[PDB]
Amino acid sequence: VSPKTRTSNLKNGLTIASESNPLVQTATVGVWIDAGSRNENAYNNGTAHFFEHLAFKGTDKRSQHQLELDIENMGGHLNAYTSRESTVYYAKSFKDDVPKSVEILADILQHSKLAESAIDREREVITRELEEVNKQYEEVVFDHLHATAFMNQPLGRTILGPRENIQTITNTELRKFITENYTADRMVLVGAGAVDHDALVELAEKYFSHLPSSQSPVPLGTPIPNFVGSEVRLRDDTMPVAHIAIAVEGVSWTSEDYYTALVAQAIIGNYDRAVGTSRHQGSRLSNIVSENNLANSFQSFSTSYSDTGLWGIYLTSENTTQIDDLVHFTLKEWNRLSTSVSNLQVERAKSQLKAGLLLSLDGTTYVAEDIGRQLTTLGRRVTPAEVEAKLEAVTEHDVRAWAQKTLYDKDIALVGLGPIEGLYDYNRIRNDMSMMRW
Amino acid sequence: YMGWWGHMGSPPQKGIAGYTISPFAARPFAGVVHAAIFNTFRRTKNQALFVILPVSFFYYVWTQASEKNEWLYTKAGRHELAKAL
């Protein structure tokens, strides 16, 4: 039984949430923001990502060089990432270096220079990032998957944004973005590891007290996405490995089917030929794939957003003449979530998840990420007891009912990259989303 | 000259992105009226001569032959028939 997550508020509406661990000597503190690329329009798409670069380019007090020195002197590091709905800025340090790190974070968020000289310098760095993500095949596949599934909608935009916007982002629009979105009621200061809650709340009162509140304070994790069945093919015969993602519209964070979708995802599970245990996994798809050498790997996912999600699978394969078999058998395993799953598969997957959801949290950064994600998507940290109860309530009837409305005979979003000549047209893939025998 | 799925015999393909949407998401008869009128008119106009010229020529030839044959087997065509045989 893990220590309780303590939670306090400030007057502006900033949440402070902490989980102490007197067994470790380091602490991760940071700011989880309920804002990301989704909050941009088509004209300033890329702003959120751009700001993340400029946040470390110098403040009203410390210059870029001074900033570097300050963090180096603390001894730990700083890290940041921007997604579609969430921005994070955190600092891993020693126990007694926590007040320094909170001070640095408050400074880069509230009092960043955004000087025209630095904007112009980063404009080239970010331009180069456009031509180097091309190598990260999984990211390419998932960015195209969002682009097609949420065609011409805010969730369909990339985080980097288009080349055109990168050349036209001004300090004005940067300042406007962070003034509108980085408000206290959308921010959570999170501490995990060697932190005292009462100390963290004092530091928050010292550094984050002059944060603007938004005009209309909605609860944390408050959002209409219209999924498009569609495909993107990025054929490249020179690549040896095909990368394929297939997804349907999934579930949001607060869906009533949230846990049912996770259990269904665990029944299919993951596979990797490089891991020794993977040939012995219980998953039917895993057995088909390993026995027939159909793939190098597959990973089931159930990605959630505030008002929608994507549920599906990501496959990698060198077997270019049996891509048809791989996709065929994958979708036939999905069909069985509607037609055949019983207490056998469901209880097994629940057993695996009950542990998995706790296992994931194995260091201070993981714990801080968990607190921050849950507070910014649900508005609370869900205790392991509540999670154990919600998982226990998932029955085989629930999985079958969920699959029959979410998977069975539904439109998919499909992305293929690489030697995908063997991937059949949309209709033949989508026809595998039902069984004529049932 | 043809292989099979996965090795069809295409030169290597690279740089082309293809996109499409589900049949359930699309209107199958989108733009049908415009197509039925304007597209068909364009397609027909561009092929019309290749049909009209041979058809009109062979119909003319036939019409002349059939009319002569009819006339040769009347009373008036007696003499011309005698020469023709």
UniProtKB/TrEMBL annotation, chain A:
<dbReference type="GO" id="GO:0046872">
    <property type="term" value="F:metal ion binding"/>
</dbReference>
<dbReference type="GO" id="GO:0017087">
    <property type="term" value="C:mitochondrial processing peptidase complex"/>
</dbReference>
<keyword id="KW-0862">Zinc</keyword>
<dbReference type="InterPro" id="IPR007863">
    <property type="entry name" value="Peptidase_M16_C"/>
</dbReference>
<dbReference type="Pfam" id="PF00675">
    <property type="entry name" value="Peptidase_M16"/>
</dbReference>
<keyword id="KW-0378">Hydrolase</keyword>
<keyword id="KW-0645">Protease</keyword>
<dbReference type="InterPro" id="IPR011249">
    <property type="entry name" value="Metalloenz_LuxS/M16"/>
</dbReference>
<dbReference type="InterPro" id="IPR050361">
    <property type="entry name" value="MPP/UQCRC_Complex"/>
</dbReference>
<comment type="similarity">
    <text>Belongs to the peptidase M16 family.</text>
</comment>
<dbReference type="Pfam" id="PF05193">
    <property type="entry name" value="Peptidase_M16_C"/>
</dbReference>
<keyword id="KW-0496">Mitochondrion</keyword>
<dbReference type="GO" id="GO:0005739">
    <property type="term" value="C:mitochondrion"/>
</dbReference>
<keyword id="KW-0482">Metalloprotease</keyword>
<dbReference type="GO" id="GO:0004222">
    <property type="term" value="F:metalloendopeptidase activity"/>
</dbReference>
<keyword id="KW-0809">Transit peptide</keyword>
<protein>
    <recommendedName>
        <fullName>mitochondrial processing peptidase</fullName>
        <ecNumber>3.4.24.64</ecNumber>
    </recommendedName>
</protein>
<feature type="domain" description="Peptidase M16 C-terminal">
    <location>
        <begin position="169"/>
        <end position="353"/>
    </location>
</feature>
<keyword id="KW-0479">Metal-binding</keyword>
<comment type="function">
    <text>Catalytic subunit of the essential mitochondrial processing protease (MPP), which cleaves the mitochondrial sequence off newly imported precursors proteins. Preferentially, cleaves after an arginine at position P2.</text>
</comment>
<feature type="domain" description="Peptidase M16 N-terminal">
    <location>
        <begin position="16"/>
        <end position="163"/>
    </location>
</feature>
<dbReference type="GO" id="GO:0006627">
    <property type="term" value="P:protein processing involved in protein targeting to mitochondrion"/>
</dbReference>
Automatic annotation (TrEMBL), chain B:
<keyword id="KW-0679">Respiratory chain</keyword>
<dbReference type="InterPro" id="IPR004205">
    <property type="entry name" value="Cyt_bc1_su8"/>
</dbReference>
<dbReference type="GO" id="GO:0005743">
    <property type="term" value="C:mitochondrial inner membrane"/>
</dbReference>
<keyword id="KW-0813">Transport</keyword>
<comment type="function">
    <text>Component of the ubiquinol-cytochrome c oxidoreductase, a multisubunit transmembrane complex that is part of the mitochondrial electron transport chain which drives oxidative phosphorylation. The complex plays an important role in the uptake of multiple carbon sources present in different host niches.</text>
</comment>
<protein>
    <recommendedName>
        <fullName>Cytochrome b-c1 complex subunit 8</fullName>
    </recommendedName>
</protein>
<keyword id="KW-0496">Mitochondrion</keyword>
<comment type="similarity">
    <text>Belongs to the UQCRQ/QCR8 family.</text>
</comment>
<dbReference type="GO" id="GO:0045275">
    <property type="term" value="C:respiratory chain complex III"/>
</dbReference>
<keyword id="KW-0249">Electron transport</keyword>
<keyword id="KW-0472">Membrane</keyword>
<keyword id="KW-0999">Mitochondrion inner membrane</keyword>
<comment type="subunit">
    <text>Component of the ubiquinol-cytochrome c oxidoreductase (cytochrome b-c1 complex, complex III, CIII), a multisubunit enzyme composed of 3 respiratory subunits cytochrome b, cytochrome c1 and Rieske protein, 2 core protein subunits, and additional low-molecular weight protein subunits. The complex exists as an obligatory dimer and forms supercomplexes (SCs) in the inner mitochondrial membrane with cytochrome c oxidase (complex IV, CIV).</text>
</comment>
<keyword id="KW-0812">Transmembrane</keyword>
<dbReference type="InterPro" id="IPR036642">
    <property type="entry name" value="Cyt_bc1_su8_sf"/>
</dbReference>
<keyword id="KW-1133">Transmembrane helix</keyword>
<dbReference type="Pfam" id="PF02939">
    <property type="entry name" value="UcrQ"/>
</dbReference>
<dbReference type="GO" id="GO:0006122">
    <property type="term" value="P:mitochondrial electron transport, ubiquinol to cytochrome c"/>
</dbReference>
